[PDB]
Design a protein around this ligand. Sequence first.
Ligand SMILES: Nc1nc2c(ncn2[C@H]2C[C@H](O)[C@@H](COP(=O)(O)O)O2)c(=O)[nH]1
Ligand SMILES: Nc1nc2c(ncn2[C@H]2C[C@H](O)[C@@H](COP(=O)(O)O)O2)c(=O)[nH]1
Ligand SMILES: Nc1ncnc2c1ncn2[C@@H]1O[C@H](COP(=O)(O)O)[C@@H](O)[C@H]1O
Ligand SMILES: [Mg+2]
Ligand SMILES: [Mg+2]
Lengths: 241, 231
Amino acid sequence: MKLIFLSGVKRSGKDTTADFIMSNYSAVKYQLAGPIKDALAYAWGVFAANTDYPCLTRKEFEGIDYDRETNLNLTKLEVITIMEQAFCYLNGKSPIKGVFVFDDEGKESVNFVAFNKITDVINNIEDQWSVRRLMQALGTDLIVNNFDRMYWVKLFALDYLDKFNSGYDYYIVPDTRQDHEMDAARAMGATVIHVVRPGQKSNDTHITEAGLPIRDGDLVITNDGSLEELFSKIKNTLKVL
Amino acid sequence: MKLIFLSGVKRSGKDTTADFIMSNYSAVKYQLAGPIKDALAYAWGVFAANTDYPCLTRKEFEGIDYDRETNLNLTKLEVITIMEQAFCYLNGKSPIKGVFVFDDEGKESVNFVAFNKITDVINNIEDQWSVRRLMQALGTDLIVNNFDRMYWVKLFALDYLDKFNSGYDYYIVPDTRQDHEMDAARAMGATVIHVVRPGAGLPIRDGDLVITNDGSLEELFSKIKNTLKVL
Ligand SMILES: Nc1nc2c(ncn2[C@H]2C[C@H](O)[C@@H](COP(=O)(O)O)O2)c(=O)[nH]1
Ligand SMILES: Nc1nc2c(ncn2[C@H]2C[C@H](O)[C@@H](COP(=O)(O)O)O2)c(=O)[nH]1
Ligand SMILES: Nc1ncnc2c1ncn2[C@@H]1O[C@H](COP(=O)(O)O)[C@@H](O)[C@H]1O
Ligand SMILES: [Mg+2]
Ligand SMILES: [Mg+2]
């Protein structure tokens, strides 16, 4: 099995490569942001539970025919509430450094110190709450920035370890957005492929919306033409490996 | 941080190699069996409390001025409760596939299938229960063979990633004893270094480094220094 980490800003063609590979080769995919979406979909269902709030499922968090920028009109309090349930869920996948979960009959809650950082981080955010802003808050503003910088790479490793000895030719991680995550991928022998559109950028100011450095060893597919030309560049990059 | 997995049989000089590196370089060390002894020591205190049993600290589980070959005279029934407690300890580190721990008023317990699975496994162990056997029972008869082949490597993966930005030059895992675990180690980018004596061990695959311990300690030291130079 070969471990491939793709890198590319929004609309660079990185997403097309990902899809080209998944359908023309024996490949298994792992999204670093997978568990983030899972944790939110579970937290939502718990929040919106017996409310009149829109029912948002995993498919909506996946953005499948749902716009994730759609303002959800949430208050910082609701959001804190959601973030706390998301944590309870995740703590169950893999322990988050400094978080404990307590139970009061189906009512899970995080320890005060962790509840306090969530509170503090959220109160400082003045953006509007979209499915997209909640993903960035959970993943980056909270977890990476304040609890465990390597948490999403860690859940990745647990998946990889269950899968490396299977019959797939490739194992693809398409959504890495932080440099330190690329660093771990590289330490682990991953082949990093950057899909680049000559002089281009993604409209998001999040650091999860910016472009990662090409370090040596990194391969690069320059998407400066037709789609057929992208497909050839991809077939030829992979044949190299 | 260079990830190194050491391989070698008893007396090959593999342990001497782990020591010399720990002593001479910026390195951190991780034992795949660490958690096994931590959970047994945890599950022990809990059990040997109730009873009129000896006191086994984490320092004896380590074999620190204690013989782990020693028979503790345990019933298959006490071994099973011990094991169920160790599973409760472990599950808090990383979920063991198909295990759920429920609190029973200051009594965590494992779901019934996991519980029964432990019962059947412990029930066919016709050996006498020493510390050394509790470790294999826990580590291999139970977890590796019946719950998750890769569970001890998973725990390593979590600690390794944690120490990732720590400024250590090497991360050494010296106690792998199973080949499937070395495969996992190679899938994570580890360099495998075997320490062999001239004239039944883990296989030497292509890409693995081999240090032949054929001379003096100091010749062994020199081979190590030059091997680390090349990674
Ligand atoms: N890969 C990754 N995504 C993150 C991280 N922290 C937060 N995210 C969020 C921000 C993105 O807009 C979102 C990606 O969702 P998606 O578009 O479905 O792949 O995940 C992180 O550490 N890594
Ligand atoms: N590396 C490794 N060690 C294991 C595994 N299962 C059990 N062990 C234990 C049994 C040995 O007695 C022990 C070594 O402990 P020690 O003597 O404290 O260094 O490793 C396993 O899957 N991998
Ligand atoms: N190449 C060597 N030359 C001389 N003594 C050695 C050599 N390698 C190992 N030793 C001895 O072998 C012992 C056992 O090896 P080990 O437990 O595998 O580390 C050590 O404690 C050393 O004193
Ligand atoms: Mg909950
Ligand atoms: Mg317990």
